[PDB]
Amino acid sequence: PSQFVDVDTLPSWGDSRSPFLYNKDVNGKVVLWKGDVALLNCTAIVNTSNESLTDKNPVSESIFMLAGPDLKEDLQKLKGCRTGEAKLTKGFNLAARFIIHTVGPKYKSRYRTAAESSLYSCYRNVLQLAKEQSMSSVGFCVINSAKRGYPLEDATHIALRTVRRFLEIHGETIEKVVFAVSDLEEGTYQKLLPLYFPRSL
């Protein structure tokens, strides 16, 4: 039997007071899934890391384990990744063709505008890469790691708003965006999805 999670089997948000208008087409591309992003057969899955690409966190731990050691050669070639930027590697043993590696900000209240700008750039640059590579699906992890301390609800507004706006303009080439969540984040995503992706008219 297969060792991965098929994005085709996952129910879409379009199956289940905001400024955003109902948009059936965009809603059909969004998926909320509680599970380990590393299992997904999306074109690319997203790894969240530090500037040296050596961060130990639950997302990276699964991804590195499932990709295997051939990843380390690809990874050194990159020579880090700056806060807010995204970088492509092959997926090696992962079900996904690519990994997009990115680095969220270490959140500090005194740098709140900078943290917002950096997190926004993470999501924007992942999506930029996906468009550039003509990818049909992207599996997002929660880019804000618990250890970097971004307030979860604020972070989730940025994630959903950015994907909404990108899908409105550049959606046609993309079939699915999956927000892979753990129990920690699911409720907040469930809470906010209706605001960025209203279901009724």
Curated annotation (Swiss-Prot):
Residues 17-197 form the Macro domain. It comes from the Eukaryota. It is linked to Spinocerebellar ataxia, autosomal recessive, 27: A form of spinocerebellar ataxia, a clinically and genetically heterogeneous group of cerebellar disorders due to degeneration of the cerebellum with variable involvement of the brainstem and spinal cord. SCAR27 is a progressive disease characterized by gait difficulties, eye movement abnormalities, dysarthria, and difficulty writing. Some patients may lose independent ambulation. Additional features include spasticity of the lower limbs and cognitive impairment. Belongs to the GDAP2 family. This is Ganglioside-induced differentiation-associated protein 2. It comes from Homo sapiens. The gene is GDAP2. The chain holds residues 7 to 227 of 497 of the full protein.
